[PDB]
Design a protein around this ligand. Structure first.
Ligand SMILES: [Ca+2]
Ligand SMILES: [Ca+2]
Ligand SMILES: [Ca+2]
Ligand SMILES: [Ca+2]
Ligand SMILES: [Ca+2]
Ligand SMILES: [Ca+2]
Lengths: 398, 10
């Protein structure tokens, strides 16, 4: 993966980089040291071991060591590099992580660089261990200390990362329904994309956190067939992936979806809800292909023709999640950034919640469809330590 | 798998 990095001069006469090697050793020049100031101000992710492929649009792939030195010394204050690495934690010490996080928090002005470098490069399980060690050493909960030390969207990312997956989803669900309206897009995204085991844990933790059940909150915030679909999905009782492929049921479900929708006036919505909530995901993938044998429109086209509003939005999201969940998230990521500004709520939630699930597939679907990497879009839309946290959650270019 | 490399601060 070719990453793009923008460095800025920190001292008069210096970017803060120790360059290494060159075409003398038949390799491209390589970064060997980055000043802490450069690490804080650069845009992107620059690692020790990145080969420098281009500089301000000039290909320096085949340059000797002193050739790239002259280029950088005669460049301006801001320089753009194209780089590529020359091809959890391994020595995980929760106590050392907790100590370094405390030192970063207690540094005058807060050392966000260190907080991000650690937390976004530990697994959620390791973060829980760090949090336990932190409370012991400091008598403060880690999440409270960081809530006070951080602000803006960086605070949102870091606090999201510190919750268990179930706690994070439950609080995101609660936020989508709190207040006079509903954030249907977020409610749909979570309810349509979580599996049985995730929803079972969400249902349990939601009741512990909020002293009321998710289902009652959904009923109090939604109505009509939109409510029926959300309630059914949230129960998390979809059939598990079987070993036997049920070809007779595949054909019958495809016929039933057709007979309930495009073939008749109006729609038999309970029939759509039953089939699409109860059958396993691999079964429904084959149902949707068999559906095209009977229907002139595929399942997504049929939904747009049959229903509208929240119900339509939900069926469309559900079908995408069934057909190709990594591509579903790649598209939502793209939509969160493509236009003016950023839908940060969505961008953050996906990067936090999928970083340990299927981020490799998301990045692959994203680059295949959109041509540039997810890294690249995050870099154009966000800045600062917040950008850095999302890029680490991304996990590389391409 | 290589020799002693040159290092330059820029
Ligand atoms: Ca700071
Ligand atoms: Ca704060
Ligand atoms: Ca509400
Ligand atoms: Ca609304
Ligand atoms: Ca119809
Ligand atoms: Ca944007």
């Amino acid at each position: 993966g070719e990453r793009t990095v923008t460095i800025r001069r920190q001292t008069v006469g210096g970017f803060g980089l120790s360059i290494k090697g060159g075409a003398e050793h038949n390799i491209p020049v390589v970064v060997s040291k980055i000043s802490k100031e450069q690490r804080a101000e650069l845009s992107g992710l620059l690692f020790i071991g990145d080969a420098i492929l281009q500089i301000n649009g000039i290909n320096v792939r085949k340059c000797r060591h002193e050739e790239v030195v002259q280029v950088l010394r005669n460049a301006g204050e801001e320089v753009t590099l194209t780089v590529s690495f020359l091809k959890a934690y391994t020595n995980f010490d929760a106590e050392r992580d907790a100590l370094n996080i405390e030192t970063a928090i207690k540094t005058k002005g807060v050392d966000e660089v260190t907080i991000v470098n650690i937390l976004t490069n530990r697994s959620n399980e390791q973060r829980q261990d760090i949090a336990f060690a932190y409370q012991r050493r400091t008598k403060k909960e880690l999440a409270s200390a960081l809530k006070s030390a951080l602000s803006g969207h960086l605070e949102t990312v870091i606090l999201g990362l510190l919750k268990t997956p179930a706690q994070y989803d439950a609080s995101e669900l609660k936020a989508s329904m709190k207040g006079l309206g509903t954030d249907e897009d977020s409610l749909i995204e979570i309810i349509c994309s979580r599996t049985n085991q995730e929803l079972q844990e969400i249902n349990r933790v939601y009741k512990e956190m909020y002293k009321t059940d998710l289902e009652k909150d959904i009923i109090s915030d939604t109505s009509g067939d939109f409510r029926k679909l959300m309630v059914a999905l949230a129960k998390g009782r979809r059939a598990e992936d079987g070993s036997v492929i049920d070809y007779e049921l595949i054909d019958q479900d495809a016929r039933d979806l057709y007979d309930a929708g495009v073939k008749r006036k109006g729609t038999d919505v309970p029939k759509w809800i039953s089939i699409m909530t109860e059958r396993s995901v691999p079964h429904l993938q084959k149902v949707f292909d068999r559906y095209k044998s009977y229907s002139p429109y595929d399942m997504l086209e049929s939904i747009r023709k049959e229903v509208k509003g929240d119900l339509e939005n939900a069926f469309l999201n559900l079908v995408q999640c069934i057909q190709n969940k990594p591509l579903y998230f790649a598209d939502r990521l793209y939509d969160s950034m493509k236009g003016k500004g950023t839908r940060d709520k969505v961008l953050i939630r996906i990067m936090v919640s999928r970083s340990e699930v299927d981020m490799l597939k998301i990045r692959s679907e994203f680059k295949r469809k959109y041509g540039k990497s997810l890294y690249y879009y995050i870099q154009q839309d966000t800045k600062g330590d917040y950008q850095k946290a999302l890029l680490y959650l991304c996990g590389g270019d391409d | 798998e290589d020799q002693h490399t040159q290092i330059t601060k820029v």
